Every structure is written in C-alpha cells, then in structure tokens.
C-alpha cells in the first residue's frame, strides 16, 4: 500500500563510524557506552542529537570511515573534532527502507505504516500508535523504533552517483535511536581526535577561528588519506566488485613529486625566482618560460619520450596571464592559502588538461609533468602567493593546491553522470536544479505536521559551457524565516556530496536587517567539473509560524530560494554576506556570481 520498500538486513560488519564536533568529543570514551549529548547552543537547541525534530533524533553513523570524518567539525567555525568507530548490537533488527513515492517524502506516519504492513511492529497495535500520535508529538518516531529495537538504514532521496558504465557505489547511513545507542552501542576505537582543548563553548568566535587555522592542516591530510584508502580498496582493487579496470594513481606521491620538482627547478634558475615587483603578465614571456623548462620537467618527471604532455604553452600562458589580472588587486597580508587555490580554479580545465580525465598509460608521469609545469609558470605570473603567511614558496603552494584539486575529482576513475533535475537555472556556465519535481520544489510546512523538511538539488556544468570548464563552488545560501518558528536550518542534516566523498562545510545562520538566511561554505577548495557533479541536501524545520491561520493562508519565508556562488569569494566586502542573490529580483546570467534556484512553501 504505502509506496515504501522495507527489508530486514543482516549485517556482516557491525563496526560503523561517527564524526563528532569539538564539543561532542567528551561524550565518546573508548570502552564506554555512548552518552546522549546534553549540551545546547546559545539558542537552547541541542548539539549532536542528529536533528532538531525529535521524530528524527538519533545517533547518525556512516558505514564508511571517510564519510564520517567529513562530519567531524563544528558547524559554525569548522574546527575539527574527533572520529570514532562504534560497534552496533547484534541482537537488534536492522531495517532498510526506500521511498518509492515520487510525490511525497518520508514521514513518520508513512514509515510506521510501512513497518506495520511488513509485520515488524511487535509492541503496539495501529490503534495504540499511529499518525495521530506522531502529528500531536505524543510519540516520536525514533524513540518508538528504539523500543522496538530497530536501527534504521537509510539512503534518503539521493544515495550516490552512477558512473557512465552504469556502476553505483552504495552509500548507507545508520539511524540509531538514542535509547539503543546509550544502552547497547559501544565505542570500539578512537580513530583520531583533533580537538585537544577545554570547553569549546567557552571560546569566543575569534579564538574559534584561530583554532581552526591551526587544525585545518592536519585535518585536511587525515581526511584525504581516509578517502584515498577507500578509493584504493573499493574502486581500484581489481578483485573489488566496484573496480572498472582503472589505472589508479598515487596522488600523495604525485603531490610530493610535483612539489619537489618545482622547488628544485626554481631554486636552480634565478630567472624563475621572481618577486611581486617584477611579475611577468605578458602571454609571450610566459610561453617562453614554458618552452624553456618543459624539456627539463620532462626529464625530472620521468615522462616517456613521445608521450604527449597534457598541457600546451599557449593554454598555460593565457590561464596564468588571466590569473595575474584577478590576483593583481589583492594584498598578501590578507590572502588565505585556501583562497589562492580556489582563485586558480577559473580557467584551470582548459590549461591543465588532466582535470577532466587522464590517460591510462604513463599517467603518474603525465600528472607530475602537468602540475609541475602549471605551478612553475603560474608562480611567475602571481608571485604574491609566495608572500602568504606560512608558505615556503609560490611554486610549492601552487603545486600542492593543484594536486589537491585534481585529486578531488578523480580523473583516473570513470566519470559520474548527473541525476535528472527539474526547473533548472543557469549562471556562469553552472546549472542547478531540483532532484524531484514534487518533493523538492514544493515544501509543505504544516502537512503532515510541522517539523523536519529537506530537499535536494544538483550542481552541474551547463550544457553549452565550453569543454573542460571548471568552476569553484565557494558558497551556498538558503532563505530562512524572518521570524521565529517559520524556517530554521538544521545544520546536522545539511549535506554536500561530490565524487564519492562528503564535502566538509561550515553552516551558519546570518541576520541582515529583517532577513535571515543560511550560509554554507566548503571548508576546502571545491572544484566542479563535468565528470564530478555535486548534490546538495538543504535541511530545515518548520514551525507554528510558518503559515497564516486564515482562509487563504500565506506561508513564510516568502519567495524562498537557494543560491550557489560560482566565483571566488570577494576580499573587499564590508558586510561579508550579501543577501542579494536570494532576492527574487536577482538575475541569473552569463557573468553572475550566483545561480539562484527558487522554490515554494505552502501548507
């Protein structure tokens, strides 16, 4: 009856993983039962309970270690916390469900009806516990499931991308009710703890940022290593069901080799040891620098003779000359390392060549050759990046950032096909659209009852964009309610996914005049390519003020929308946040910094 597929799952691996924010590290002690967080934020909202809606509160665990590691940051500041392996009880029932209703998202009443129809609800009749109890908050979904000793396995409305061959790596999330978690779930291992401080809530906003700058380095390297270990085992090992015969590359070695070669070839030629006062912006001079040292980089990179370099003198020089224009109006004392790498994404695909894909023969040498050549020439065009605080050289930050960007899009594995989308909008060669016409474009604030709401949209390179277009995805905004109990963000459920990785993001609510809105920013530079589209889940809770109590009810926020920024964030903005792209008067276009995607909110 209820278009939901329900399956009882027998697990083979009972150890799952949980990323925690700095304030939640104290709740996870190895060898102890899990502690349900009693901490609250400044508004009184719980932190670490899985949702602001009690129906969906629980211990959310990821099957894969590298997915959970992406969650282990403080939402507002991005300070990394800790990562833990936890053991699930074997005496309970694991129930995977899948919504097959394209017109309606999952609700507590729908799920419990589907579970009753399969003979899974043992303790209550339909008269004792049905939708009327959930709609009146007399009973809550996950708490009732915990008494039934049920752990939910959930894929939501978007699981993972399918590649061009038709292969889809499964993504599983465990929703463990808190009564099961605190009584039967144990912390098996402390994988890694980054936050060593005392009372994170005592820190003010300033010193939270200082802590993040100290810890973002180690956390980035651990996360990348986790994702590289998963890719090697599941996607690269030929004996794995999900292998495609790909020639996977050692991207950590590629980074260190590219950085060593750039440093050596720069420190041996004073011509390449340029300062900001004698930067080279002429395309012709930059082409000669390419052609003078490309044969030397060929030998140092062990590139086989006859194997084509994925770069050309012309494209690298135009890209570098263009970056000199945009970097020209910037100061070194206020330029972030991550901002510099994000700023080289525009134009990167036309010049580097391996951002969209790399050949399966001599690939490791081609990658080192491309990154080393690109970093060498760009270092001459924008020498200001060598003056950033704590950079040892312009060529080293450019080579390291380039290798990091290219590794993130996995050019040595098959590309991903974007899901179909609805009501698309396009700006600056970037298209966004809702994943489901009826579920995502129209949010019902009060039916079945006020509470948790989420919708998905996809980010992709536009159809008519030039080949190899790469775009920086630097910010995601979402309209919120101007008054309380209308539309508030649920940052625990905001979710960004690219390739097979979760993109770590800060989430914060900002108030400008009478407007409230969410600001979601990836913690590390994020590059959109045709091979790696991006899916975003935006999550909210509605309330008793979401709509009016009159004959023709209007609902708030009015003119709801999300917006994706596709250009580097400005270094010259007085108020840091511009609410402009969320306003319905905003015009999507060829040169717009944002692409705005509106939706509707009714009863």
Residue numbers in the entry: 4 to 606
Manuscript text:
As crystals of the DT homolog from S. peptonophila were grown in a condition containing potassium iodide, a 2.2 Å dataset was collected with native protein crystals at a wavelength of 2.0 Å to maximize the anomalous signal from iodide. The structure was subsequently solved using iodide-SAD phasing. Whereas the homolog from S. albireticuli (S.a) displays a Tm comparable to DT (46.5 °C cf. 48.25 °C), the homolog from S. peptonophila (S.p) is significantly more thermostable (Tm = 59.5 °C). Of note, however, AT and PT contain both Cys residues (C217/C231 and C239/C251, respectively) that bound this region, and the crystal structures confirm formation of the inter-fragment disulfide bonds. In ATR and PTR, the 16 amino acid insertion between β9 and β10 contributes to an ~25 amino acid “lid,” hinging at ATG550 and ATN576 (PTP571 and PTD596), that folds back over and occludes the presumed receptor binding surface. By contrast, in AT and PT, only Y54 and E148 are absolutely conserved: in both, an Arginine is seen in place of the H21 residue; and in AT an Asparagine is seen in place of Y65. The T domain of PT contains three His residues: H272, H276, and H364. Two of these residues are structurally equivalent with His residues in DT: PTH272 ↔ DTH223 and PTH364 ↔ DTH322. Rather than forming π-stacking interactions with a second His residue as in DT, PTH272 forms an edge-to-face π–π interaction with PTY296.
DT homologs from Streptomyces albireticuli (17% identity to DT) and Seinonella peptonophila (20% identity to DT), despite showing no toxicity toward human cells, display significant structural similarities to DT sharing both the overall Y-shaped architecture of DT as well as the individual folds of each domain. Moreover, each of the individual domains preserve their respective folds: the central split β-sheet motif in the catalytic domain characteristic of the ADP-ribosyl transferase (ADPRT) superfamily; the three-layered α-helical translocation domain; and, the Ig-like jelly-roll fold in the receptor-binding domain. Additionally, both DT homologs maintain the pinched disulfide loop at the junction between the C- and T-domains. Given these structural similarities, and for purposes of clarity and simplicity, we refer to these two DT homologs hereafter as Albireti Toxin (AT) and Peptono Toxin (PT). By striking contrast, we found that AT and PT do not display any measurable toxicity on Vero cells even at µM concentrations.
